[PDB]
Amino acid sequence: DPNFFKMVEGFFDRGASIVEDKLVEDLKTRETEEQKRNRVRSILRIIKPCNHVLSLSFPIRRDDGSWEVIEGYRAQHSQHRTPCKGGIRYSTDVSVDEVKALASLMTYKCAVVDVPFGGAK
Amino acid sequence: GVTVSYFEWLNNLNHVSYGRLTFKYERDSNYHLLMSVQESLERKFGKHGGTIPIVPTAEFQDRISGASEKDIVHSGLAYTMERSARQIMRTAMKYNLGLDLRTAAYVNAIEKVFRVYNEAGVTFT
Numbered sequence A: 001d002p003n004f005f006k007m008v009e010g011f012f013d014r015g016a017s018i019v020e021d022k023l024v025e026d027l028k029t030r031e032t033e034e035q036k037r038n039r040v041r042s043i044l045r046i047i048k049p050c051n052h053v054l055s056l057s058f059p060i061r062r063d064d065g066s067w068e069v070i071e072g073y074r075a076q077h078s079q080h081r082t083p084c085k086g087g088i089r090y091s092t093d094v095s096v097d098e099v100k101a102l103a104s105l106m107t108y109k110c111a112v113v114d115v116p117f118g119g120a121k
Numbered sequence B: 001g002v003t004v005s006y007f008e009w010l011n012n013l014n015h016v017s018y019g020r021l022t023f024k025y026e027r028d029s030n031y032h033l034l035m036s037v038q039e040s041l042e043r044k045f046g047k048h049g050g051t052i053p054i055v056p057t058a059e060f061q062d063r064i065s066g067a068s069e070k071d072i073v074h075s076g077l078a079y080t081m082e083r084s085a086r087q088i089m090r091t092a093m094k095y096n097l098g099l100d101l102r103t104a105a106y107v108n109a110i111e112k113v114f115r116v117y118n119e120a121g122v123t124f125t
């Protein structure tokens, strides 16, 4: 029973240590054999983190005239294909760490089935 | 520098420097006041023939010839920083805070930021 956000990011780092080699060879450009390495390792650092993350705060007025502060989140992982699609969850245990995770997970989920828009949550 | 940052935002938002349309206008109005004091006296003491050369001071002249935008800024600042102290002095009495000023600073802020949520209907429902 390991942490989850480590699991997802754990796969990406693992799956990038595999494709990295067969991917340098299939590049076309006027570079060295080492400038390509610095080009692949580099793009793979750009795909990994989450571009945008927001954080909100609401003045809601309860039914009994009271007030309280609701607190939300939304993370858009990638912008490479627009829009971004991602569900909304209502739960008292929605951290900002698990929103980054599930957002990144959809950018790859909706890529294996060739659905254009990127990931969010 | 927050106050002057507010003045720069207005300068960039009026699309004209400060006073460009008024410096030479307010300059003439000063010399016509002096020439008015001169004439008015020389209608009473004037039969004696003595001229009365009413003229600006050597400092008030150094204020007319070099009147620029820089003066209006260093003025609107000295007016903010003064109108605002009188409100901290006051609050330091309305709550009997003595020589605790820091608390009176935050008390003014909260008491003004409160009057904006209250008279607005915070909820859009």
Ligand SMILES: NC(=O)C1=CN([C@@H]2O[C@H](COP(=O)(O)OP(=O)(O)OC[C@H]3O[C@@H](n4cnc5c(N)ncnc54)[C@H](O)[C@@H]3O)[C@@H](O)[C@H]2O)C=CC1
Residues within 6 Å of the ligand: A081, A110, A111, A113, A114, A115, A116, A117, A118
């Ligand atoms: N030759 C190959 O290895 C592959 C060829 N295809 C071909 O693509 C054509 C139709 O695929 P569609 O995507 O439906 O049409 P499309 O013409 O609109 O596809 C545009 C390109 O973007 C890729 N793509 C799709 N969704 C993506 C996403 N979310 N993120 C990143 N890339 C994405 C596709 O694989 C395709 O190469 C067919 O000709 C099919 O055989 C699709 C996958 C692999």
